[PDB]
Amino acid sequence: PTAAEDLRHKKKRLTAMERVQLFCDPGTFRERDALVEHECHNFGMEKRKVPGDGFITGTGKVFGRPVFLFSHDFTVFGGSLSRTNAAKVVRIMEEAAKIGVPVIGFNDSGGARIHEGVDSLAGYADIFLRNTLFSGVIPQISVIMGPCAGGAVYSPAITDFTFMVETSSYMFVTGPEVVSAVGGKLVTKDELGGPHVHATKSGVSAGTFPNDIVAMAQLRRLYSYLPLSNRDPVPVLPTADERYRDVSSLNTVVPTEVKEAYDMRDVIYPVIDHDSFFEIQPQFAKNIICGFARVEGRSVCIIANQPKVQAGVLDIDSSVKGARMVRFADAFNIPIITFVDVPGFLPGVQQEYGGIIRHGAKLLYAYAEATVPKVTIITRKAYGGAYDVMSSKHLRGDSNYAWPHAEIAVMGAAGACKLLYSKETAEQQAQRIADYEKTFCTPLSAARKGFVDAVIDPSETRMRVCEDLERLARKQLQNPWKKHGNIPL
Amino acid sequence: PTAAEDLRHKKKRLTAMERVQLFCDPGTFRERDALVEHECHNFGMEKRKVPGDGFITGTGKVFGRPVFLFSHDFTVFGGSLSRTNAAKVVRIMEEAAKIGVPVIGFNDSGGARIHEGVDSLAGYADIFLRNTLFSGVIPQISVIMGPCAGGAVYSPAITDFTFMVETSSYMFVTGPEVVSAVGGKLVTKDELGGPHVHATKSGVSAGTFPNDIVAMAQLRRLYSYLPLSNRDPVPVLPTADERYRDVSSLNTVVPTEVKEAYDMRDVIYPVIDHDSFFEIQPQFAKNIICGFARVEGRSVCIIANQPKVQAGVLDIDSSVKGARMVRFADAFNIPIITFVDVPGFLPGVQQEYGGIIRHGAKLLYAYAEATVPKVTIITRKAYGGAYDVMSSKHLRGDSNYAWPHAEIAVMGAAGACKLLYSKETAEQQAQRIADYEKTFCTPLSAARKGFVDAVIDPSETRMRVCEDLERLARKQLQNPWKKHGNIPL
Amino acid sequence: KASYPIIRVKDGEAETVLQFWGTNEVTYGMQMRGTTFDVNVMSDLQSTLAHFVPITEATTNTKQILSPMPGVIVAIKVQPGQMVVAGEELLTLEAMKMRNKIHAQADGKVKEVKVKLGATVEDNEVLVELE
Ligand SMILES: O=CCCCC[C@@H]1SC[C@@H]2NC(=O)N[C@@H]21
Ligand SMILES: O=CCCCC[C@@H]1SC[C@@H]2NC(=O)N[C@@H]21
């Protein structure tokens, strides 16, 4: 019996129920509500009632841990929401708020249902309010499998992570017809809101998958990292890997020349456990890396610069990416580990015309507000305000480390030499820049002041990180009483 | 005796002490620390010690209410910060955190002090952490009277409001010398970070003043609105104006044609008390108005659309502006009053390439998260998701009102008629669009559903607003327990 | 051992040693007799559903290569209008004190005009054109 799904598969596409079956465990899905009708009675809609009413909501179970989910249905009315569709979603989110369980939704709606009038707006508003209230209480993940247009786009935005499917998905606020009507330009749906556009240009989508099957397979892996609720502790899984594994290849990663580049992944991979990195937003703002990883069987958060791309310089997009990652990680009590290599901020008129001052402050706010244990490692250099922003010791950092060839200075040697000698005799470059770099572009001064705990061999990083992260397991820090902060938007 | 200030005034500029004297009451300033030296002992700095060390910090008193302030000094070392300058500021902010008092700072620093090494970075980090921790506890206002470059720019950014002086002030992260070095373009300091640029292009500065004297005079007026701390109640001042003043001119403000424009200030001004509006960011994103005002002697927050500019259409910049205003107003228990007139969102490729999805969600998050009393008035129209965003009744709104000629529909009549009749006989425009607009583009349906409390004459708005704002004085609402939210950055 | 290379397997007397490269949870990168393969391990549902999945073809473009970011060209490696092979460095831009090195991903030859040493122009120009 394979009835009524032949029409769907013929278009090389899967069904909502099949997606739900693929996500959860083999036999642990219990559909909650299945016999519900729209009761519209307008515009010749009194007929063609549907039992499911276009939504599939259940409970399920992943890796032995509970979950909640819902999936849109494209065959029935195009997946449009109504006064009645939104009730099921509201009930699921409320139940997942009472119990410490997350929510995952597979969006496929074609837009609002016009035949209901303003009831669709009512349902949208209720879903928006539930998302707003419960953000930071239970993790929310959203996946977009098909078209997603109109005002329905906003609820995925408030969710913590949004993923996209490559061939047959798109998302935008207004359709290309209106764009043609007002501006006069003919742009296709994919050219407007395709997965690539949101992966590279707008920065909304947190990832892209080639197929639905791969999407489910990796969504399970992502779910294996998250904590169940706000009050539950960070999960710890058994692992045969051990902190005594030898990592001596880190002694040679940093080149002896100051103008040559290297890949920061060569430093990230040895420290964490084998094959346990899940990069977030891999194709957007490549000069910074963010993602999840495990250290001795417990999930941690990774944020590191990359001198491979644009000399590892902070920017607007990198600031937004890092700020969102830090805020989410702190909201759910996940340790943060950072690797620092920054020469400063990206210079340019477009930057000031785009508001670098606002955006660069977001990362600093996220780092200063955080109360989870932090570990910082300075590999090569840290200059100016970039050193302050990237989790400096003064921002209530727990432990800070440096490598023997690091440099921590106010600015580059040339600018310091220029400002320290206004009209000093010519040729001052040769006998002053070298001396200043020798005397003050080294971690000795910063260690004398007390800004780094110790200068360590690069081969001891795994040992030190495991020791510190084990000791810091029970830190309790609290901020002054506030209704909420006022972050620079 | 007018010694040592002749050199300053000759350049048509004022001094820090003169600014402090102008701000506070005639004789209520008590300078806190005045005999402090830098104790540097490097690069020939062992000499030329200064008593004040370039900073003036005190307590003062404005309108009989306490304050705290500090002012940079440009004559002494260019206003550079140090390990010692930042200590005074930290002490002032800590004291103003223990006591429920705000802080106001007049920035004039030329950058960091190179002769101290990384101690300047240490001081910057401490100030950044204090700003981050105490934001949302005590209001913070910052004014920029002169140059402000380097990494020192970030602390004004975290503060709630930043104002600028016209002729002799600028702010940016990196100087034009580096821009010339890397990109090769010659741009002046004013062309890069002048007050106009931040007033119109970047949206960082919240206002601009022509002179320092006017800056102080209006800063006092702004201070008269704010509450003293997080736990203190909203100030109420005596006022001879009364809720029984006749406003019948509102019956004629809205034109009888749907394509003609009008000025929303003609609706804003009658409702509030006379000469009591303080616009915020007047020259940026003119399609939305935000500011402070008084209603029956108590300060409230005003957020309204404007069909004069771009048909009152929501956008990226307007969303950011409104979101920041709502967040600040809610953080300190200030009532919010909104006027709604929106046809939707601005359509265009640049918008999606710039991330409309992220930015438009910020206003919705700010409106949904808020727990202060809200009053909403729909004058003419509200369509699509814009109706949901602008404080709809479903987002825990207290009271909502509409005017007799309003319209609340899913979308415009043309699109609805197109979607409701795919290949219906030609000429369907004339006998379908008119009928649909007549039947469903009216507040009767939204009133039937229960989305507006009542349909009122435009002459009763002041009476209704005063009644509701008086009754709602003691509302107590609380959100679920969270360490903090996760707003879409 | 989990997430490790060596895998010792012994059926009866026969003994084999294979290697485990990596995976994406539907495809396994395993080495057999010093050769890489990608075995697919999927259940009944995944097998019956993988038939109904689009398989798009990636762009096969043999054309000019552009510099991703502005900079300065200080060193060049390849010659104008000769053979080029995959993985060969072509030139090195230096920007904000950093020498990168864009190479040739994959191709057989080129037809183009070289950008001369010290040409501080970049801005996504056509440094090398592949034809
Ligand atoms: O020496 C002239 C250009 C130096 C730029 C150094 C890098 S580029 C972006 C960032 N901003 C700075 O001021 N320094 C770094
Ligand atoms: O009828 C064709 C153009 C109608 C646009 C109506 C305004 S323009 C911006 C906003 N977006 C919409 O879909 N409607 C409004």
Numbering used by the authors:
A (entry chain C), B (entry chain H): 34 to 522
C (entry chain V): 535 to 665
What's the paper's own text on this?
Here, we report three structures of endogenous LtPCC: an α6β6 dodecamer, α5β6 undecamer, and α4β6 decamer. To sort out LtPCCs with missing α-subunits, we performed symmetry-relaxed 3D classification and determined two additional LtPCC structures: α5β6 undecamer, α4β6 decamer. The α5β6 undecamer lacks one α-subunit, and the α4β6 decamer lacks two α-subunits on opposite sides of the LtPCC complex. In our decamer, undecamer, and dodecamer, the conformation of individual subunits is preserved. In other words, the structures of these complexes differ from one another only in the number and positioning of α-subunits. We utilize the α5β6 and α4β6 architectures of PCC to demonstrate that PCC oligomeric isomers differ only in the number of α-subunits. For each oligomeric isomer, the α-β binding site is either occupied or unoccupied. In other oligomeric isomers, at least one active site cannot participate in catalysis, and so all non-dodecameric PCCs are less catalytically active than the dodecamer. We found that most endogenous LtPCCs exist as α6β6, and in descending frequency, LtPCC also exhibit oligomeric isoforms with the oligomeric formulae α5β6, α4β6, α3β6, α2β6, α1β6, and α0β6.
One such multienzyme is propionyl-CoA carboxylase (PCC), which catalyzes the carboxylation of propionyl-CoA to form methylmalonyl-CoA, a precursor to the citric acid cycle intermediate succinyl-CoA. Propionyl-CoA carboxylase (PCC) is a multienzyme complex consisting of up to six α-subunits and six β-subunits. The α-subunit of LtPCC contains three domains: a biotin carboxylase (BC) domain, BC-CT mediating (BT) domain, and biotin carboxyl carrier protein (BCCP) domain. The β-subunit is composed of the structurally homologous N-carboxyltransferase (N-CT) and C-carboxyltransferase (C-CT) domains.
